[PDB]
Amino acid sequence: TVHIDLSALNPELVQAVQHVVIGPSSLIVHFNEVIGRGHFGCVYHGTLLDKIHCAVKSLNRITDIGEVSQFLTEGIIMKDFSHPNVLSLLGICLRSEGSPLVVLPYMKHGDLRNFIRNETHNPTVKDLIGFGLQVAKGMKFLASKKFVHRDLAARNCMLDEKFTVKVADFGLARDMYDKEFDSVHNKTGAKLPVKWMALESLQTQKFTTKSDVWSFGVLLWELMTRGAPPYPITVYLLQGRRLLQPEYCPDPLYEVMLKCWHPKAEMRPSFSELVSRISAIFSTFIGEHYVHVNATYVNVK
Ligand SMILES: COC(=O)[C@@]1(O)C[C@H]2O[C@]1(C)n1c3ccccc3c3c4c(c5c6ccccc6n2c5c31)C(=O)NC4
């Protein structure tokens, strides 16, 4: 029931965010065409004009000026996170009574996990490695900004009409699949995706680019299994265990996954090194090896 007067925002902040703001005459939200919903609010199809098909994330109302301010600040920072393998922020709107919109690109093929799981899709080893390379490129960029993702997973990357992978679920593009999984940014989550988290993250809450590299290794395993659930966990890993080599995963790529899960965080490869190594492995394939699900992983949750 709380009224919020947005004129209480700091005028310097309002000026600073203007280049991120999409005016109402430039945006049509297609309220009859829902893309998906969660605790956060709802994502609708949209049209943005100079037209362009977009996704409009409508957040629950914000009634605290400090929280509004943090949202605008995040908008300014995220607007500069521009890379072909990172989901872009097209802009924001803040309507009467604190009703926020985050305008994002529309991703024809949805999330990467569902895409590779779909039986009607026929990926090759080359394709799946190429998806992994794209993710490594997006992560190299994020790491260059000193940004630690925490939430890297196949479900949190999206695929557009050109089959370009965009690392997602960060910044104002957070809250992906928020009924299935809590964010690794949530200190007290009851549904944390522990199967993607580095050992030192599980044990001592240390989150770094090197723990992102661990998550990336799990993501590579997701790709090569066509979206099996990992380990179909701290005590398990400490027995001396890792994810098994996928049946269609090339040996050099499995060696890379093992490096990503090095027990010493400092000894894991950088995302720059991963882009280099995976680019080389990718280049050896010609698209003749079709990848299928492991019978013992099908339908496992
Ligand atoms: C139940 O679905 C989800 O929770 C998603 O994370 C998954 C689903 O909508 C959610 C809410 N989602 C989101 C949750 C939070 C922010 C963005 C999204 C989101 C986006 C897109 C899509 C999408 C595209 C095609 C099919 C399904 C799609 N979804 C999204 C986006 C998109 O194209 N761009 C952003």
Side-chain angles (χ1 to χ4, degrees):
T1 56
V2 171
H3 177 239
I4 178 162
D5 185 336
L6 299 172
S7 72
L9 294 162
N10 189 319
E12 304 179 297
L13 181 57
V14 175
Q15 176 170 152
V17 78
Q18 280 317 287
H19 71 291
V20 193
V21 174
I22 293 170
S25 91
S26 299
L27 180 70
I28 297 170
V29 181
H30 300 127
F31 291 104
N32 296 287
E33 288 156 34
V34 170
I35 287 169
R37 73 187 65 244
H39 285 75
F40 70 85
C42 188
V43 181
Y44 300 95
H45 289 274
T47 295
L48 178 69
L49 199 269
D50 238 63
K51 68 196 162 157
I52 148 176
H53 192 188
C54 62
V56 177
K57 189 193 182 192
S58 174
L59 290 313
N60 300 326
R61 211 160 65 84
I62 305 165
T63 55
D64 181 280
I65 286 286
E67 290 178 17
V68 173
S69 293
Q70 171 173 312
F71 169 86
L72 298 176
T73 291
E74 190 152 26
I76 291 167
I77 296 163
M78 187 183 185
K79 182 75 200 302
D80 299 339
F81 276 32
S82 165
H83 185 277
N85 303 115
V86 173
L87 189 71
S88 68
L89 173 61
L90 301 182
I92 59 170
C93 314
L94 189 59
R95 300 190 180 180
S96 186
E97 294 291 356
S99 304
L101 304 173
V102 174
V103 188
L104 302 167
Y106 184 64
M107 298 286 120
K108 179 181 176 179
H109 289 112
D111 72 277
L112 190 54
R113 191 191 184 230
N114 276 147
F115 181 85
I116 65 190
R117 283 174 63 87
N118 192 320
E119 313 101 291
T120 66
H121 299 181
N122 300 278
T124 54
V125 168
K126 187 169 186 71
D127 288 347
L128 295 166
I129 301 184
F131 295 154
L133 181 51
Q134 289 191 63
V135 172
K137 291 175 166 180
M139 292 303 304
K140 178 186 167 158
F141 173 83
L142 292 178
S144 82
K145 300 295 204 191
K146 312 307 195 173
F147 180 73
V148 178
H149 193 302
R150 302 193 186 195
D151 283 313
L152 186 61
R155 73 178 177 274
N156 289 331
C157 299
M158 305 200 86
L159 202 58
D160 74 9
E161 79 276 10
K162 270 189 252 198
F163 308 97
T164 300
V165 180
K166 309 297 190 172
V167 173
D169 198 35
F170 73 95
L172 299 186
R174 68 170 58 90
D175 304 310
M176 289 273 293
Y177 295 115
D178 72 359
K179 305 150 73 59
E180 256 185 289
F181 288 107
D182 293 315
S183 176
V184 175
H185 290 276
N186 186 344
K187 300 209 188 163
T188 65
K191 299 189 180 180
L192 292 175
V194 294
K195 285 170 166 193
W196 283 264
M197 293 168 59
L199 235 205
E200 72 281 2
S201 303
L202 293 166
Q203 290 177 311
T204 62
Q205 295 68 59
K206 281 181 201 261
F207 298 95
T208 62
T209 287
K210 295 306 201 200
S211 59
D212 278 350
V213 165
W214 182 296
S215 299
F216 174 77
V218 181
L219 183 155
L220 286 178
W221 187 96
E222 296 186 86
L223 284 173
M224 300 321 294
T225 58
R226 295 190 59 179
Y231 309 95
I233 192 64
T234 309
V235 171
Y236 182 85
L237 292 166
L238 281 182
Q239 289 165 1
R241 306 181 189 269
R242 298 293 187 254
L243 290 160
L244 302 181
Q245 181 174 175
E247 43 187 14
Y248 297 99
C249 179
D251 292 358
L253 195 67
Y254 193 54
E255 292 158 15
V256 166
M257 291 176 195
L258 295 182
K259 290 177 177 284
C260 293
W261 308 319
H262 202 296
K264 295 176 167 183
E266 341 77 71
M267 298 301 290
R268 295 174 201 150
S270 68
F271 281 112
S272 285
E273 169 164 344
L274 287 163
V275 168
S276 183
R277 284 184 178 266
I278 294 171
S279 72
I281 294 159
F282 173 79
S283 76
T284 70
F285 292 89
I286 63 161
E288 75 184 348
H289 299 318
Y290 292 80
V291 179
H292 311 289
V293 294
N294 183 312
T296 69
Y297 298 174
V298 173
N299 307 316
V300 173
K301 278 173 255 173

